[PDB]
Design an enzyme around this catalytic site. Structure first.
Site, PDB file in Angstrom:
ATOM      1  N   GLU A 125     106.643  15.312 -16.561  1.00 45.24           N
ATOM      2  CA  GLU A 125     106.322  14.836 -15.217  1.00 45.24           C
ATOM      3  C   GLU A 125     104.978  14.143 -15.030  1.00 45.24           C
ATOM      4  O   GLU A 125     104.862  13.253 -14.189  1.00 45.24           O
ATOM      5  CB  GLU A 125     106.418  15.994 -14.227  1.00 45.24           C
ATOM      6  CG  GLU A 125     107.764  16.682 -14.221  1.00 45.24           C
ATOM      7  CD  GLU A 125     107.753  17.955 -13.402  1.00 45.24           C
ATOM      8  OE1 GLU A 125     106.859  18.802 -13.644  1.00 45.24           O
ATOM      9  OE2 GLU A 125     108.636  18.110 -12.526  1.00 45.24           O
ATOM     10  N   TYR A 126     103.965  14.543 -15.796  1.00 46.86           N
ATOM     11  CA  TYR A 126     102.640  13.936 -15.655  1.00 46.86           C
ATOM     12  C   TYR A 126     102.224  12.984 -16.768  1.00 46.86           C
ATOM     13  O   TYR A 126     101.365  12.131 -16.559  1.00 46.86           O
ATOM     14  CB  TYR A 126     101.569  15.016 -15.517  1.00 46.86           C
ATOM     15  CG  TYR A 126     101.741  15.905 -14.314  1.00 46.86           C
ATOM     16  CD1 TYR A 126     102.766  16.851 -14.263  1.00 46.86           C
ATOM     17  CD2 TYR A 126     100.878  15.808 -13.224  1.00 46.86           C
ATOM     18  CE1 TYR A 126     102.926  17.681 -13.158  1.00 46.86           C
ATOM     19  CE2 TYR A 126     101.027  16.633 -12.112  1.00 46.86           C
ATOM     20  CZ  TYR A 126     102.052  17.568 -12.085  1.00 46.86           C
ATOM     21  OH  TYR A 126     102.199  18.393 -10.994  1.00 46.86           O
ATOM     22  N   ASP A 148     104.047  18.984 -17.796  1.00 48.74           N
ATOM     23  CA  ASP A 148     102.930  18.122 -18.159  1.00 48.74           C
ATOM     24  C   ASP A 148     103.362  16.905 -18.967  1.00 48.74           C
ATOM     25  O   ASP A 148     103.053  15.772 -18.599  1.00 48.74           O
ATOM     26  CB  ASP A 148     101.892  18.933 -18.934  1.00 48.74           C
ATOM     27  CG  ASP A 148     101.411  20.148 -18.159  1.00 48.74           C
ATOM     28  OD1 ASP A 148     102.264  20.968 -17.751  1.00 48.74           O
ATOM     29  OD2 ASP A 148     100.184  20.287 -17.959  1.00 48.74           O
ATOM     30  N   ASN A 168      93.511  21.541 -13.517  1.00 52.26           N
ATOM     31  CA  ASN A 168      92.627  22.611 -13.969  1.00 52.26           C
ATOM     32  C   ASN A 168      92.742  22.923 -15.461  1.00 52.26           C
ATOM     33  O   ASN A 168      91.827  23.511 -16.038  1.00 52.26           O
ATOM     34  CB  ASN A 168      92.920  23.885 -13.186  1.00 52.26           C
ATOM     35  CG  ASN A 168      94.374  24.290 -13.283  1.00 52.26           C
ATOM     36  OD1 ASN A 168      95.249  23.623 -12.730  1.00 52.26           O
ATOM     37  ND2 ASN A 168      94.642  25.367 -14.010  1.00 52.26           N
ATOM     38  N   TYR A 169      93.853  22.548 -16.091  1.00 52.18           N
ATOM     39  CA  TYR A 169      94.017  22.839 -17.520  1.00 52.18           C
ATOM     40  C   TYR A 169      93.573  21.754 -18.469  1.00 52.18           C
ATOM     41  O   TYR A 169      93.592  20.562 -18.154  1.00 52.18           O
ATOM     42  CB  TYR A 169      95.472  23.184 -17.900  1.00 52.18           C
ATOM     43  CG  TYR A 169      96.357  23.783 -16.824  1.00 52.18           C
ATOM     44  CD1 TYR A 169      96.644  25.292 -16.805  1.00 52.18           C
ATOM     45  CD2 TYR A 169      96.908  22.965 -15.854  1.00 52.18           C
ATOM     46  CE1 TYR A 169      97.550  25.766 -15.676  1.00 52.18           C
ATOM     47  CE2 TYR A 169      97.725  23.446 -14.840  1.00 52.18           C
ATOM     48  CZ  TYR A 169      98.048  24.843 -14.753  1.00 52.18           C
ATOM     49  OH  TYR A 169      98.854  25.361 -13.766  1.00 52.18           O
ATOM     50  N   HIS A 181     101.780  33.468 -15.865  1.00 53.13           N
ATOM     51  CA  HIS A 181     102.482  32.251 -16.222  1.00 53.13           C
ATOM     52  C   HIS A 181     102.565  32.139 -17.729  1.00 53.13           C
ATOM     53  O   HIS A 181     102.000  32.951 -18.460  1.00 53.13           O
ATOM     54  CB  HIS A 181     101.745  31.030 -15.675  1.00 53.13           C
ATOM     55  CG  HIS A 181     100.331  30.929 -16.152  1.00 53.13           C
ATOM     56  ND1 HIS A 181      99.299  31.635 -15.573  1.00 53.13           N
ATOM     57  CD2 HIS A 181      99.790  30.260 -17.197  1.00 53.13           C
ATOM     58  CE1 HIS A 181      98.182  31.406 -16.241  1.00 53.13           C
ATOM     59  NE2 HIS A 181      98.453  30.575 -17.232  1.00 53.13           N
ATOM     60  N   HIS A 189     102.836  29.069 -21.113  1.00 54.22           N
ATOM     61  CA  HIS A 189     102.587  27.697 -21.555  1.00 54.22           C
ATOM     62  C   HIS A 189     103.605  27.557 -22.684  1.00 54.22           C
ATOM     63  O   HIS A 189     103.409  28.113 -23.762  1.00 54.22           O
ATOM     64  CB  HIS A 189     101.175  27.554 -22.134  1.00 54.22           C
ATOM     65  CG  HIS A 189     100.083  27.753 -21.130  1.00 54.22           C
ATOM     66  ND1 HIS A 189      99.678  26.758 -20.266  1.00 54.22           N
ATOM     67  CD2 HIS A 189      99.305  28.827 -20.860  1.00 54.22           C
ATOM     68  CE1 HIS A 189      98.695  27.210 -19.508  1.00 54.22           C
ATOM     69  NE2 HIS A 189      98.451  28.463 -19.847  1.00 54.22           N
ATOM     70  N   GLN A 238      98.537   9.954 -20.958  1.00 52.93           N
ATOM     71  CA  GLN A 238      97.649   9.143 -20.131  1.00 52.93           C
ATOM     72  C   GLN A 238      96.387   9.850 -19.652  1.00 52.93           C
ATOM     73  O   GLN A 238      95.510   9.215 -19.077  1.00 52.93           O
ATOM     74  CB  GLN A 238      98.395   8.559 -18.922  1.00 52.93           C
ATOM     75  CG  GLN A 238      98.940   9.574 -17.932  1.00 52.93           C
ATOM     76  CD  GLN A 238      99.434   8.924 -16.639  1.00 52.93           C
ATOM     77  OE1 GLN A 238     100.097   9.563 -15.820  1.00 52.93           O
ATOM     78  NE2 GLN A 238      99.102   7.653 -16.450  1.00 52.93           N
TER      79      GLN A 238
HETATM   80 CU   LIG Z   1      97.351  30.093 -19.053  1.00 51.59          CU
END
Ligand SMILES: [Cu+2]
Ligand SMILES: [Cu+2]
Lengths: 620, 620
Positions: A293-294, A290, A373-374, A423, A425, A298
């Site tokens: 790469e993203y 995040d 989605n997050y 997953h 974080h 922004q």
């Molecule tokens: Cu999660």
């Protein structure tokens, strides 16, 4: 006049003009990243040189460039052509996200895959995610995005409730062509909807909640000057903002008596990775950097008063550049306010008859971002007692998949046929230390149990030990909650009245680190995430634990590379990199929208002051 | 009409009358403990039988007694003579505290010790603490208190700043005679004062703090009926109060739809021990079983509005018995209120265009107690999402000693010549589970790392495993933060819509457990503190992890004894005992009065509900 002031729309426009005049920003160019550079070590040279760093992408397929410009002098300091196949691709462009679903819509393979599932392509949304680096040499040096499909029944429907498993496509957003379409088999598309604003799912809304009013009749206790310089209850700092790192804290210092004592020169979340633990080929390559790469910065939300930030809030509206170099303001992207924090200190003494109680307070600086989605909330806290803390809040909608018939060891079931892959974080907080100045060192502190016997006949004694990390090769540490392990950052040349080096103790949550196999691709690209604490010798070009170009990069760069220099860190200008994160095994309670879960860390003064620093707080 | 209502002053008076009429409470008798008994399992028998349990001490030296009375029927259910030398001494009486300093004042050994230090006995305060159990067979069956000295220069002076090391005395509060006076050598009495309300130490008070106003124009969202029954945002519970355990929560349940679902039948802090790790003979025997030996409940403070509890507070004033059986009210000893808790859930969806945000809230129930130099705050929290949490807050003045010349491995230096012995604050939360009823079981959950290879070619997969604890002999567990270990309490006979057993997950902080040597006296008397989690089969007489009489008791009783029964706990009426605490290496910042430090735990729903339970919360 401050060299740490936020970027202005004018500076962005000027960077744009500089690049244009230099021929570095023609019609085919795009700004993939743009940020202001921090002042170099040693401001002994008055008059700052406002410099900006830019990554320029070429939609024509030409090579990208890394350029440093001086807005002060209106010049290009340096411009270097980049070889993405070696050093990595530039951050994904927002305009590159829409093209994936658009290109796939007219691809026969994609259409055949959808028709086999009886899905109307007009209702199929495609989540464009980073491709990472795997066994596809075809992608070497190409900007590829992988797309996963979700069905959206109507414009206000939550597509996440309808994942389309067994299907994934790869797209080259530059040549604008679908490279591959993989179909491993049809999976029932979960039918239940996850519309949390739908009365049929929410049921009658509660009417039991009475209002809670929080106000400050005399305004906040903190002052804001120079646009982003904060002064609060002895604390002093500058609130910066970067499109990649988000909110960054500069020059954290505490006014102890008549002297301003530095603690942390720069604090930021230098990286955030979300590795998925589902071995299915449809998602095994799934890893979001995040920050890297993203660019979480922004996608910062505009926070609404009373909703996102309650009470007497003072906002900051950072400006960033769009893909063409035009300034774009993120209105109310940053909230700042102070809030009550219960009891600070309390003691009712029988002998003296004195009953004493004092309230605590914390200064809060935060922002919230949305990545597909997050939704992540980043919060920095400064307390009256000198404690510094960071808290990440994770919410949004869980990334879904189909729940395999027969169960799964790597996926949870949220609704009939609906799965949520396991997953994590994981965050990395980059702490450029300055405990009473730049001459710092780190000690690992462990509790030490003692054996009953000579000198400990009753077997009640216990102690602690501290080990100085002298070279980077020995500064990659792991947690040990069982022995209450912490790390103390001290200044060996600055002592308290008790003749002890002043310091701050970092308290981690000791959550699990990267679980992936040591030889996995994610283990190498996110090597920092495999250990709890790293300490490096400060360097101008060592900014992120994953290097400057994470997008589609082989790996190893970042911390593992830096550490290799094995530089002296015993009483030097050092940086602490703390890995911390959440390991998520989605529960039914996380669906259709998830409640906030948190993780973080804090640093408390350790012999930094000569006595409690809050004795001067009034009875309120 | 509720069987779980607080005790009334009338019931206490009636217990007193019952005991008197039965000849169990003559002039020489004293009530060392008095509490209401919880309703026995199975209220199938209407009309409750309000019973009280009492420990009756005899100042004449006669044997104490344990008596159970029925206030409903005005009778003595049972009365048993106690053999303290075997089962342990009764809790220390408040009136027994003043006698120590008084008796020592005229003891030649004590006076000689003070004169050798040039200390005026009129200025010497004596902290009376529990003696524990050591190599003094002389104390077998005797109520002995050990006294440590502190100098108080003037009536408002903080004696803690002036510890008198190298000296300790033992006193028999019944025969009222000094048994022993130990002097290991003179130590300089720290001279600096620790008066935190003294302008010369605090300096000019800050004038920078603007007020923070918290109000509820429409009143609180919670209702209180039956005097102590709480209803809040779907939560249902009864707030009880015990002189030994303090605030106790009964019948914690959540209204899910049209059915009230139980979660926890009874939640309390069943014990709190403060073991010191200083091998000096002057303090090596130092261990406070605040809950067990002193009864933290009877020292609950009267909390002031705006100071201790801010906002719209609803108070409870529990009544307790004094040493003679007279009711004594603890005015405003319990605070109850709801407070905002940031963001609950949030998601800005690009595809649907829906931007959703909801605030979180927590119901707070707390009290604060003072034990000599320490002040502890106990807080229970109920959140909108179903999470249950406990937080202990430690503050007050650190217990001091002299700081040895040449340093110490078990003591910190706070001021010139002033030391603070290392120690821990360890709690045990007794959780009588009732996840959707009494048929519960506990599973230990560990994250499971997977090896790269067949079925995990990319090496990204990770999983989790759960091990059911079937018998008590296998239910003594330890933490493992590295593998994200937690424990799930579930009901195998009650499943969610996904056909999965409903449950709650306990998240510990994974702090260090008892550090003392396994063969130490404290390791045996506080055996529970050596492990993070214990699970027992519910029993009427298994109330505390340390047994009913901790004061001067050999040890082993409590959990180690209970577990020996090796009863079935796989789908039975069970109790979870969670050990958690703070390991304290005092810092200069803790002096002269310490800032609050915290520790606790929480339990979150795990497949308890069929989807998020907060979808019906309004936009506010
Ligand atoms: Cu999660
Ligand atoms: Cu302590």
């Amino acid at each position: 006049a401050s060299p740490f002031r936020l970027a202005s729309a004018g500076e962005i426009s000027e960077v744009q003009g500089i690049l244009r005049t230099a021929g570095l920003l023609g019609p085919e160019k795009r700004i993939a990243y743009l940020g202001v550079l921090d002042p170099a070590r040693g401001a002994g040279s008055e008059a700052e040189d406002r410099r900006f760093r830019v990554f320029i992408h070429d939609v024509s397929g030409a090579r990208p460039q890394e350029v440093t410009v001086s807005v002060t002098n209106g010049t290009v300091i340096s411009a270097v052509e980049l070889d993405t196949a070696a050093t990595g691709e530039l951050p994904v462009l927002e305009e590159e996200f829409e093209v994936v679903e658009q290109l796939l819509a007219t691809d026969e393979r994609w259409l055949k895959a959808l028709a086999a599932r009886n899905l109307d392509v007009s209702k199929v949304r495609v989540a464009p995610l980073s491709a990472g680096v795997f066994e596809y040499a075809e992608e070497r040096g190409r900007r590829i995005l992988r797309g996963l499909a979700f069905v959206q029944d109507f414009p206000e429907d939550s597509a996440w409730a309808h994942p389309v498993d067994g299907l994934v496509a790869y797209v080259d957003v530059v040549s604008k062509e679908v490279t591959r379409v993989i179909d491993t088999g049809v999976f029932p598309v979960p039918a239940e909807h996850g519309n949390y604003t739908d009365p049929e799912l929410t049921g009658p809304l509660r009417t039991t909640q009475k209002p809670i009013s929080i106000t400050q009749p005399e305004g906040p206790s903190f002052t804001v000057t120079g646009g982003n310089h904060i002064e609060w209850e002895k604390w002093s700092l500058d609130v910066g903002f970067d499109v990649r790192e988000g909110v960054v804290l500069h020059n954290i210092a505490f006014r102890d008596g008549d002297r301003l004592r530095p603690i942390i020169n720069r604090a930021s979340i230098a990286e955030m990775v979300v590795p998925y633990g589902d071995p299915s080929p449809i998602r095994s390559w799934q890893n979001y950097f995040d920050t890297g790469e993203y660019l979480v910065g922004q996608y910062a939300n505009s926070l609404e008063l009373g909703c996102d930030c309650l009470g007497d809030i003072t906002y900051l509206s950072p400006v960033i550049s769009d893909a063409f170099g035009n300034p774009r303001e993120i209105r109310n992207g940053i909230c700042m306010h102070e809030e009550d924090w219960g009891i600070l200190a309390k003691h009712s003494d029988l002998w003296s008859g004195i009953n004493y109680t004092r309230r605590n307070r914390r200064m809060v600086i935060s922002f919230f971002t949305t990545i597909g989605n997050y939704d992540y909330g980043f919060y920095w806290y400064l307390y009256l007692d000198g404690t510094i803390e960071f808290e990440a809040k994770a919410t949004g909608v869980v990334f879904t998949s189909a729940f395999p018939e027969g169960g799964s060891d790597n996926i949870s079931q949220l609704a009939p046929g609906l799965g949520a892959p396991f997953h994590q974080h994981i965050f990395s907080a980059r702490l450029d230390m300055a405990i009473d100045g730049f001459t710092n060192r780190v000690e690992e502190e462990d509790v030490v149990r003692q054996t009953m016997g000579p000198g400990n006949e009753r077997g009640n004694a216990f102690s602690r030990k501290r080990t100085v990390l002298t070279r980077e090769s020995e500064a990659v540490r792991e947690a040990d909650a069982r022995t209450g392990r912490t790390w103390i950052i001290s200044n060996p040349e600055s002592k308290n009245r008790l003749n002890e080096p002043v310091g701050y103790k970092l308290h981690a949550h000791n959550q699990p680190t990267l679980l992936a196999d040591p030889g996995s691709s994610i283990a190498r690209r996110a090597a920092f995430a495999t250990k709890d604490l790293w300490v490096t010798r400060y360097a101008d070009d060592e900014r992120y634990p994953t290097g400057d170009f994470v997008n589609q990069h082989s790996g190893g760069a970042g911390l593992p590379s830096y550490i290799a220099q094995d530089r002296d860190i015993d009483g030097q200008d050092i940086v602490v990199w703390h890995t911390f994160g959440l390991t998520h095994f989605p529960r039914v309670e996380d669906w259709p929208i998830m409640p906030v879960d948190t993780v973080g860390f804090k640093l408390r003064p350790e012999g930094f002051f000569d006595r409690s620093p809050v004795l001067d707080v009034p009875a309120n």
